[PDB]
């Protein structure tokens, strides 16, 4: 919308009045604003100056949006110190920061239980396609941070290692709760052959042949 | 040799008797040499007296009391040397004279009642606690008083402070919050402070009077008209909220600590606590937070004048400002003698409740002191002190300096009154105060940096631990001789001037004078002067002074040097730095590791084993020379005869040197000839090259004595003897154990070879797998009594030279619970240099070696003689330690010039002064060459040929000159022994003093293909025969993860640690050479699953089709 500041050396604030709703945007008596007296806008943006809250933003502006800020933001300091580094990296991190979403109008699980994107769609693109009906089971924009993050990761073996394991197992144990061992910290706590590189699913299930020892293996097949 | 000394400014006074921080502090605590009726308090006195007019529950009625009169000092049950070989605390019985009057009367004075072993100090400054020596250090805490300061979790508002001496009074904080109130925090308690204003006689209109009108915070502290009531009533809402479990009106039994007397509250006798809480507060206070028994009630003294500077601080006027909580005039120092005395208010503590419970059960007539006291709480609590507190440190005996360095230390850490390992960014930092009190370039690299540190040379601690630093007084333009030792709070109001500043005869010389005030650096008028420092040494730490050209070194890469100089290890043919700073000699004397003579006489008998003299008709002492004894790091210091068998002496001069000393002068390392430059990346990044030459001369060699020990216990399977008789051992083995179990002295040691046999029965079981494959590596199956002898641990070793024996029962030999008979063999070794060994300069250029090169390589000068160490340049730039480069110059100087010099702190020589001798050396050096008949050759000129094109040389001048010109320019031409052609650029060369540090690869370095598998965790640990067992952390893995290192990861989590199956399996595997591993399912996995069920929860296992596993097959 539009704007207009009011008073000087007593009660500071500002107002974001579009057409009708004049949102009372205060200031603690010591703020360094920068969007003068008149200006013009669009949704969720740096008004005062200072910072940019994660959650508060998101909510009223979307998930990607934050992401963008995130990384970049982060980068800004890194850059300010000689740091160089493909952005990609920082991104990848971020990714999980989204991974979870809350719920409303469900078609199967609890009416809140935080949740994984994919899990939401192999179930929200599967309760309207082959198994039509029930309810799409929508979600919303949810933000975790490394910390809060991991913690809700479905896997437990890994899930342990943090805060107070008790809890994790506790609840877990109760319902079946499986893992699938898809991850690193996962397959390692146990000491498997990591689902990576050599221990992946595309370059380890390969059997090598030696040109001549392929014709002593071609006469024991047509028998 | 012949010594010149630079700069003047004559030290009006040598330096403090150093070791003063431990001796001069500990003697004025335990006054056993001063009539007992005398003694002006503190230490044991003020400790026996703070807790001695010790009554008995019930005031007046039933008798029983017990008081004090004087304390008797003990006499060493043992001598310094024995109490050490025998593992004793070199304590010293301490008796006290008690007498307890009854209610019916009786003057029964039980003649000295043993209270506990109080350890006597040493000439050194350390002690003898359970064997070795420790350094009861000196901490530094917040000096008592009141300052206030702002609020932390609430900006804009202010909190008040009331700190009395610690361990003699509660912590008190008057923080004003948002509720309007001014609550009172005390020993973990936050109640409405209005409840303590009324207890000290304050109404509902005099709390609004002296402190309202301004700051309407008094109308939050006010409306609570349910507690603005009665005097002995605001005492039960205070004794029913401060101490639950007891609601009696005996709320002046507990509310009797935190105030009157000195049981708890009080900040010194009226010093820092009062003299400070007077000038900044509301003037006038004697000695405790208010006062009780005055006429009836409590007549407040210091809970209102400080509540009249904290609220006039949250609005207020001038004069009322925050205090700096890290200022020295605001900071204290707990010396030695007092820290044991405080473990006496704690040694006399659990003892004033070991009698007040003994006069309730036992007849009150049948009582006489020495029958009421057990005296275990001063032994167990004053032995607990020299045996465990984070402050009672080992003692760095590397060299003698460190020894002392240690002492000088200052810690913040501490038992209770101290600082944890997670704070301090308002303290750690160096403060505008320190100047001359606490050096700023001595603290440790990281982890601790700040909190810990060494005192600033001259500076002395005094009275209530106030650091005092020496200044010289003037008559406003003139210059006195009088010198002013003064505290900091006594310095923030004087306009002091550098000593660096020009002074004629004995006064001021010039009008542009540099001076400081409080802390700010300004220029001042010649008579606008108060004082003037005694010198700069007054400014830097003790060792931070040994620095030669500090005047030209970064501040950072410097401490490194003062430091490191500590991790300095001695060598034989030691030698003191060519360039010194004077003190250089003194350090050696105050350390005491060197031997001097009290009175002047003359020597008669003289050998490595002793030195007999015949002082001036003062008899004939005969002090022995500790020969090759072990340090604590291992080191191995030994004094050495340095006098003749016939000569009048000099009133006590080097009666013979110490470890790393040369005729009275500190010889940390060995000044050697260096060549600054790059070699085939053979000093790269921070490496250094050496010339075989030193090994030849055996120049950098260290002696070291490793201490081995053993313990034989008493068991059910039988007692653990120790005889030169142990089965299957083939005589050629025992071969050197004449002692009947011990190795003879002078025996050459190897590894695995026997050191101390020791047979224990054990058994009752049968071997099996995972040790019967090894086993025969440790048995041949067996015996009814096993080997378990000592044997030399991998790598170490050397030539023996010392054996000690004990046995549960000797006079003073006391063995723990279960043990019997001890033994300790002492074997040492020569160590020369070994590629990789560590070494550096005082100038912070730490640098190890990678290539010892033959005297055939080793870029040599033109006159044949080769350099020694190549000190690449690169390591100098990014760091700012010029000076070192300056030492090299003076070096070449001091070479041909034949001498030593002393470039003290900011008083050293100078470029113009040095060029002087440098040329003075060239005129000589070259006079030597032309004199021989030569005079520069193609090689040289060719250099000078470019030396000019480079402008370092003045063009248009004979070759010869371009040399001197250059020579004086501190460099010269250098020949690369390998190729006749010299380097193409003059080279800075010279004699650089260096050193050998604590670290020496020899003690690091390991490798294990297999070996000792733990039995606990099921993996590689310890190491009897073969050794080591490297660790592996997450990082490692993650990265491992980084690469698709699959197996490299898995093989790194199995057959190389837990999974017992594998390690053997694998181990075998190679013995034949097969693929080798492929472990079934990693140990740990199963373990856990089982540690799981071993706590409920199945913890099953399925695949892709979700089906039952078979995870354990057994």
Curated annotation (Swiss-Prot), chain A:
Annotated disulfide bonds: none
Organism domain of life: Bacteria
Its job: DNA-dependent RNA polymerase catalyzes the transcription of DNA into RNA using the four ribonucleoside triphosphates as substrates.
Family: Belongs to the RNA polymerase beta' chain family.
Subunit structure: The RNAP catalytic core consists of 2 alpha, 1 beta, 1 beta' and 1 omega subunit. When a sigma factor is associated with the core the holoenzyme is formed, which can initiate transcription.
Name of this protein: DNA-directed RNA polymerase subunit beta'
Designated gene of the protein: rpoC
Parent-protein start and end of this portion: 1279 to 1501 of 1524
Curated annotation (Swiss-Prot), chain B:
Keywords tagged on the record: DNA-directed RNA polymerase, Nucleotidyltransferase, Transcription, Transferase
GO molecular function: DNA binding; DNA-directed RNA polymerase activity; ribonucleoside binding
InterPro entries found in the cross-reference section: DNA-dir_RNA_pol_bsu_ext_1_sf (IPR042107), DNA-dir_RNA_pol_bsu_external_1 (IPR019462), DNA-dir_RNA_pol_su2 (IPR015712), DNA-dir_RNAP_su2_dom (IPR007120), DNA-dir_RNAP_su2_hyb_sf (IPR037033), RNA_pol_bsu_bac (IPR010243), RNA_pol_bsu_CS (IPR007121), RNA_pol_bsu_protrusion (IPR007644)
Record-annotated membrane-spanning stretches: none
EC number(s) on file: 2.7.7.6
CDD domains for this protein: RNA_pol_B_RPB2 (cd00653)
PROSITE patterns per the UniProt record, alphabetical: RNA_POL_BETA
Residue pairs linked by disulfide bridges in the UniProt entry: none
GO BP term (any one): DNA-templated transcription
Catalysis: reaction(s): RNA(n) + a ribonucleoside 5'-triphosphate = RNA(n+1) + diphosphate
One family name in Pfam for this protein: RNA_pol_Rpb2_1
Gene Ontology cellular component terms for the protein in this record: DNA-directed RNA polymerase complex
Function: DNA-dependent RNA polymerase catalyzes the transcription of DNA into RNA using the four ribonucleoside triphosphates as substrates.
Family, per entry: Belongs to the RNA polymerase beta chain family.
Assembly: The RNAP catalytic core consists of 2 alpha, 1 beta, 1 beta' and 1 omega subunit. When a sigma factor is associated with the core the holoenzyme is formed, which can initiate transcription.
Protein name: DNA-directed RNA polymerase subunit beta
Organism: Thermus aquaticus
């Amino acid at each position: 919308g539009v704007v207009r500041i009011e008073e000087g050396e007593d009660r500071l604030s500002v107002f974001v009045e579009s057409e009708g709703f004049s949102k009372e945007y205060k200031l603690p008596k010591d703020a360094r604003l920068l969007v003068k007296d008149g200006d013009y806008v669009e949704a969720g943006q740096p008004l005062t100056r200072g910072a940019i809250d994660p959650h508060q933003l998101l909510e009223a502006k979307g998930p990607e949006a934050v992401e963008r800020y995130l990384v970049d933001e982060i980068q800004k300091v890194y850059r300010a110190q000689g740091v160089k580094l493909h952005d990609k990296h920082i991104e990848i991190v971020v990714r999980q920061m989204l991974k979870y979403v809350e719920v409303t109008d469900p078609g199967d699980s609890r009416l809140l239980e935080g949740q994984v994107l994919e899990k939401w769609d192999v179930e929200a693109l599967n309760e309207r396609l082959i198994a039509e009906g029930k309810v799409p089971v929508a979600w919303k924009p949810l933000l975790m941070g490394v910390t809060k993050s991991a913690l809700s990761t479905k896997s437990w073996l890994s899930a342990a290692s943090f805060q107070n394991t008790t809890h994790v197992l506790t609840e877990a144990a109760i319902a079946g709760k499986k893992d699938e061992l898809i991850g690193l910290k996962e397959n390692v706590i146990l000491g498997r052959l990591i689902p990576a590189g050599t221990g992946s699913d595309f370059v380890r299930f390969t059997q090598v042949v030696d040109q001549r020892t392929l014709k002593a293996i071609e006469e024991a097949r047509k028998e | 040799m012949e010594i010149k000394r630079f700069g003047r400014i004559r030290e009006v006074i040598p330096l403090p008797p150093l070791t003063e921080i431990q001796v001069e502090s500990y003697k004025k605590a335990l006054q056993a040499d001063v009539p007992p009726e005398k003694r002006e308090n503190v230490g044991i006195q003020a400790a026996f007296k703070e807790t001695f007019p010790i009554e008995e529950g019930d005031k007046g009625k039933g008798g029983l009391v017990l008081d004090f009169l004087e304390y008797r000092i003990g006499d060493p049950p043992f001598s310094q040397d024995e109490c050490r070989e025998k593992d004793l605390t070199y304590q010293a019985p301490l008796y006290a004279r008690l007498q307890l009057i009854h209610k019916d009367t009786g003057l029964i004075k039980e003649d000295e009642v043993f209270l506990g072993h109080l350890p006597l100090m040493t000439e050194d400054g350390s002690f003898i606690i359970n064997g070795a020596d420790r350094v009861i250090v000196s901490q530094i805490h917040r000096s008592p008083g009141v300052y206030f300061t702002p609020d932390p979790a609430r900006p804009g508002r202010y909190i008040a402070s009331i700190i009395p001496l610690p361990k003699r009074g509660p912590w008190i904080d008057l923080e004003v919050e948002a509720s309007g109130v001014v609550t009172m925090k005390v020993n973990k308690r936050k109640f409405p402070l209005v409840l303590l204003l009324r207890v000290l006689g304050y109404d509902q209109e005099t709390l609004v009077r002296e402190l309202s009108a301004y700051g309407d915070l008094v109308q939050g502290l006010l409306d609570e008209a349910v507690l603005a009531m009665r005097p002995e009533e605001a005492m039960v809402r205070l004794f029913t909220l401060l101490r639950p479990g007891d609601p009696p009106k005996k709320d002046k039994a507990l509310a009797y600590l935190f105030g009157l007397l000195a049981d708890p509250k009080r900040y010194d006798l009226g010093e820092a606590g009062r003299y400070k809480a007077e000038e900044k507060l509301g003037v006038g206070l004697s000695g405790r937070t208010l006062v009780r028994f005055e006429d009836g009630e409590f007549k407040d003294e210091v809970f209102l004048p400080t509540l009249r500077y904290l609220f006039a601080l949250t609005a207020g006027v001038p004069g009322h400002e925050v205090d700096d909580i890290d200022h020295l005039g605001n900071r204290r120092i707990r010396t030695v003698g007092e820290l044991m005395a405080d473990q006496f208010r704690v040694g006399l503590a659990r003892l004033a409740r070991g009698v007040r419970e003994r006069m309730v059960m036992g007849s009150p007539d049948t009582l006489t002191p020495a029958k009421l006291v057990n005296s275990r709480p001063l032994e167990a609590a004053l032995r607990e002190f020299f045996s465990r507190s984070q402050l009672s440190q080992f003692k760095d005996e590397t060299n003698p300096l460190s020894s002392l360095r240690h002492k000088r230390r200052i810690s913040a850490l501490g038992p209770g009154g101290l600082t944890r390992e997670r704070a301090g960014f308002d303290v750690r930092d160096v403060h505008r105060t320190h100047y001359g009190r606490i050096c700023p370039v001595e603290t440790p690299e990281g982890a601790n940096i700040g909190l810990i540190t060494s005192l600033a040379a001259y500076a002395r601690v005094d009275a209530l631990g106030f650091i005092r630093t020496p200044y010289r007084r003037v008559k406003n333009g003139v210059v006195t001789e009088e010198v002013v030792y003064m505290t900091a709070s006594e310095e923030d109001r004087y306009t002091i001037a550098q000593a660096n500043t020009p002074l004629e005869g004995d006064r001021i010389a010039t009008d542009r004078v540099v001076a400081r005030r409080r802390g700010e650096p300004v220029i001042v008028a010649p008579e606008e002067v108060e004082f003037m420092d005694v010198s700069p040494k007054q400014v830097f730490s003790l060792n931070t002074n040994l620095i030669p050209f500090l005047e030209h070194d970064d501040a950072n890469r410097a401490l490194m040097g003062s430091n490191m100089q500590t991790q300095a290890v001695p060598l034989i043919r030691a030698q003191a730095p060519v360039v010194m700073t004077g003190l250089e000699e003194r350090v050696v004397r105050d350390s005491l590791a060197a031997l001097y003579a009290e009175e002047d006489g003359e020597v008669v008998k003289v050998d490595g084993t002793r030195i007999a003299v015949r002082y001036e008709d003062g008899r004939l002492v005969e002090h022995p020379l500790r020969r090759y004894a072990r340090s604590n790091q291992g080191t191995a210091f030994d004094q050495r005869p340095r006098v003749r068998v016939g000569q009048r002496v000099k009133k006590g001069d080097l009666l013979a040197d110490g470890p790393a000393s040369e005729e009275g002068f500190l010889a940390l390392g060995q000044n050697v000839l260096v060549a600054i430059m790059p070699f085939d990346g053979y000093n790269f990044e921070d490496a250094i090259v050496i010339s075989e030459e030193l090994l030849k001369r055996d120049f950098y060699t260290s002696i070291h004595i490793e201490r081995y020990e053993i313990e034989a216990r008493d068991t059910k399977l039988g007692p653990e003897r120790i005889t030169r008789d142990i089965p299957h051992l083939s005589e050629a083995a025992l071969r050197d154990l004449d002692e009947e179990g011990i190795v003879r002295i002078g025996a050459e040691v190897k590894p695995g070879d026997i050191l101390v046999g020791r047979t224990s029965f054990k058994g009752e079981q049968e071997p099996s797998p995972e040790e019967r494959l090894l086993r025969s590596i440790f048995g041949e199956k067996a015996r009814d009594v096993k080997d378990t002898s000592l044997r030399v641990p991998p790598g170490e070793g050397g030539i023996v030279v010392g054996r000690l024996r004990l046995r549960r029962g000797d006079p003073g030999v006391e063995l723990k619970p279960g043990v019997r008979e001890v033994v300790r063999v002492f074997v040492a070794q020569k160590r020369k240099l070994q590629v990789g060994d560590k070494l550096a300069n005082r100038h912070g250029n730490k640098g190890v070696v990678a290539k010892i090169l033959p005297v055939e390589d080793m870029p040599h000068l033109p006159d044949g003689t080769p350099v020694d160490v190549i000190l690449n340049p690169l390591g100098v730039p990014s760091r700012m330690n010029l000076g070192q480069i300056l030492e090299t110059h003076l070096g070449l100087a001091g070479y041909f010039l034949g001498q030593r010099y002393i470039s003290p702190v900011f008083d050293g020589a100078t470029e113009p002064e040095i060029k002087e001798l440098l040329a003075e050396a060239f005129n000589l050096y070259f006079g030597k060459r032309q004199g021989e008949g030569f005079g520069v050759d193609k090689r040289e000129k060719e250099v000078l040929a470019r030396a000019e094109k480079l402008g370092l040389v003045s063009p248009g001048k004979s070759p010869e000159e371009q040399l001197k010109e250059l020579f004086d320019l501190g460099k010269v031409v250098l020949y690369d022994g390998r190729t006749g052609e010299p380097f193409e650029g003059p080279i800075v060369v010279g004699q650089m003093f260096i050193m050998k540090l604590y670290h020496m690869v020899e003690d690091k370095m390991h490798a294990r293909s297999t070996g000792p598998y733990s039995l606990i965790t099921q993996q590689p640990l310890g190491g009897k025969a073969q050794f080591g067992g490297q660790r592996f952390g997450e990082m490692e893995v993650w990265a491992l993860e980084a690469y698709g290192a699959a197996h490299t990861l898995q093989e790194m989590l199995t057959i190389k640690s837990d999974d017992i199956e594998g390690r053997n399996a694998a181990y075998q595997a190679i013995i034949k050479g097969e693929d080798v591993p492929e472990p079934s399912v990693p140990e740990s996995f199963r373990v856990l699953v089982k540690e799981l069920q071993a706590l409920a929860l199945d913890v099953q296992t399925l695949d892709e089709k979700d089906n039952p596993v078979d995870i354990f097959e057994g």
